[PDB]
Design a protein around this ligand. Structure first.
Ligand SMILES: COc1cc(N2CCC(N)CC2)ccc1Nc1ncc(C(=O)OC(C)C)c(-c2cn(C)c3ccccc23)n1
Length: 305
């Protein structure tokens, strides 16, 4: 088979037509604001998160942030984050849909007390749906983790952070990264030793991400140096069974951690198996006692021409 053309549109916004309101976070990436976007002459107000780079004079950053805008402009799926546009000011800044509840990792940590088994299973499904879409687009995330899942509503989550994502080239099956900084606790063994990333690499990361949710935001391999992580997997060890997981749920994430990538599950299969569990959540997770804004429009209703 061959590759089809990518007719995704990239919209360039003016600095005048959106207003920053408050700071959500700050760091090396720059600053991320909460704001409103008002397309000129369209009579809509779209709540947005705006991110501008910290330093204007950073040539590597601008090349790397435009790479993220390229990836996000090419994806349209209910469970993958939505890019609204970019602004080419002195400090380049891109505009994304606002996810009012922050990252899913912080959410389960802040609400560990009363999260039901149905939410956890539905989240597993929705994340699998996003990842199956990226596989259909020949896109490899390479950074799937609970911290990189944003929450629109408690019943609707989305995948984000494509700073490391790569589009698998035509008639290519692996990426073969040259090198760089990476999150080791979420990486498949083949990626650790050989810098090889595939769609089955992301399935491994999916297994760890599920493990973060089932443990209510616990840190994987806590206390262990990342240096010694590789030798641990080679000797056959994995992450322990979360106390709320039945054997049925734990069996699936273990399959995500087999060294032969070809024998690991595929996102299309993970959807089905978690969809089946979501029909009766309490059979598969045993949790103690689980039983002017007039013209505002959500970004998921503001479709581009
Ligand atoms: C309400 O809204 C949010 C609030 C927060 N809490 C921050 C700390 C406390 N005040 C309590 C509330 C967190 C997130 C959001 N919503 C949101 N929506 C979209 C994005 C996004 O796609 O960012 C693009 C522009 C890069 C982000 C976001 C992504 N990254 C990497 C961040 C880093 C720091 C802060 C926010 C973000 N966040």
């Amino acid at each position: 088979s061959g590759e089809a053309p990518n007719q995704a549109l990239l919209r360039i916004l003016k600095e005048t037509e959106f207003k920053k309101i408050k700071v959500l976070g700050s760091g090396a990436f720059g600053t991320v604001y909460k704001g409103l976007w008002i397309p000129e002459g369209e009579k809509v107000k779209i709540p947005v998160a705006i991110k501008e780079l910290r330093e204007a004079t950073s040539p590597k950053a601008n090349k790397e942030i435009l790479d993220e805008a390229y990836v996000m402009a090419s994806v349209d799926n209910p469970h993958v984050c939505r890019l609204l546009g970019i602004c080419l000011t002195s400090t380049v800044q891109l505009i994304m849909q606002l996810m009012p509840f922050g990252s899913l990792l912080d959410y389960v940590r802040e609400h560990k007390d009363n999260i039901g088994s149905q939410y956890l299973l539905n989240w597993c499904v929705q994340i699998a749906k996003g990842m199956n879409y990226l596989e259909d687009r020949r896109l490899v995330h390479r950074d799937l983790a609970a911290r990189n899942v944003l929450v629109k509503t408690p019943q609707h989550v989305k995948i984000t952070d494509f700073g490391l994502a790569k589009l698998l080239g035509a008639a290519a099956a692996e990426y073969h990264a040259e090198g760089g900084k990476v999150p080791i606790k979420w990486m498949a063994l083949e990626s650790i030793l050989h810098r090889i990333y595939t769609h089955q690499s992301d399935v491994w990361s999916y297994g760890v991400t599920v493990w973060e949710l089932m443990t209510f935001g616990s840190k994987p391999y806590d206390g262990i140096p990342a240096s010694e992580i590789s030798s641990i997997l080679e000797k056959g060890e994995r992450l322990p069974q979360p106390p709320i997981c039945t054997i049925d749920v734990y069996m699936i994430m273990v399959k995500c951690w087999m060294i032969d990538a070809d024998s690991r599950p595929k996102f299309r299969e993970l959807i089905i198996e978690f969809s089946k569990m979501a029909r009766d959540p309490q059979r598969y997770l045993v949790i103690q006692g689980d039983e002017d804004m007039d013209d505002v429009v959500d970004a998921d209703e503001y479709l581009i021409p």
